[PDB]
């Protein structure tokens, strides 16, 4: 909730809210260990 209202604050002041600007290269790696086979990940939307 804090995160969301924070993005709302940047949106209200006109600042872009859902685009990082210091760890772009680091954010390339997908989240782990929640990108494995469907056996490990019971959900599909997070898997994709």
């Amino acid at each position: 909730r804090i995160w969301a209202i924070w993005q709302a604050l940047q949106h209200y002041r006109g600042l872009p809210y859902n685009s990082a600007n210091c760890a772009i290269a680091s954010l390339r790696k997908p989240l782990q260990p929640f990108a494995q086979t469907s056996t490990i990940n019971p959900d599909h939307i997070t898997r994709d």
């Binding site: 006109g14 600042l15 872009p16 685009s19």
Partner: protein, 48 residues
């Protein structure tokens, strides 16, 4: 200044007129050289 704050999209107009803020670096020099190659022509196409 020139940042659109949502620059993740770089769509191309083809007959569409866009603001200088929405103008992109990739198409900047492309338009520059296009007009350079258009201006000096003669005949009915001639800029003069």
């Amino acid at each position: 200044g020139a940042r659109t704050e949502e620059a993740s999209y770089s769509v191309s107009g083809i007959g569409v007129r866009k603001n200088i803020n929405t103008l992109t670096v990739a198409e900047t020099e492309s338009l520059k050289k296009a007009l350079r190659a258009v201006q000096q022509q003669s005949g009915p196409r001639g800029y003069q």
